[PDB]
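FAQ: What does a ligand-bound record look like?

Like this one, built around chloride ion:
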Amino acid sequence: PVLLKSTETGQYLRINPDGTVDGTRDRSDPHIQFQISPEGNGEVLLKSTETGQYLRINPDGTVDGTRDRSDPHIQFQISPEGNGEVLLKSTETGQYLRINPDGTVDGTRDRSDPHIQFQISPE
Ligand SMILES: [Cl-]
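The answer part, i.e. the structure of the complex:
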């Protein structure tokens, strides 16, 4: 699995079993493990290793987990930023995943927001 870490706040993305999504600095939490899988030829899904839930950014900017494979709001594009950092962009809504200093996770279209930078790393 891989971990998805906010560069700015050092928080890892987590999908909780209740479907909520937040950030944590608890490296020991198995819920921070993700599988990145292909969706068609040019996109990915971000799936919780432990719960099987997919990350979703909803049109209203909320971010949650779902097991509804038919919802196109689970599709992402990973875009290299540098150096080693990437942005995680919802294809359906054009929003970037963001972890806020308070541990909340949401979406934004502000590409210059520093809280949208992630580093993907092997666990
Ligand atoms: Cl905050």
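Follow-up question: can I read anything off the structure? Yes, for example: Residues 1-123 form a domain with the Trefoil (Acidic Fibroblast Growth Factor, subunit A) fold (CATH 2.80.10.50).
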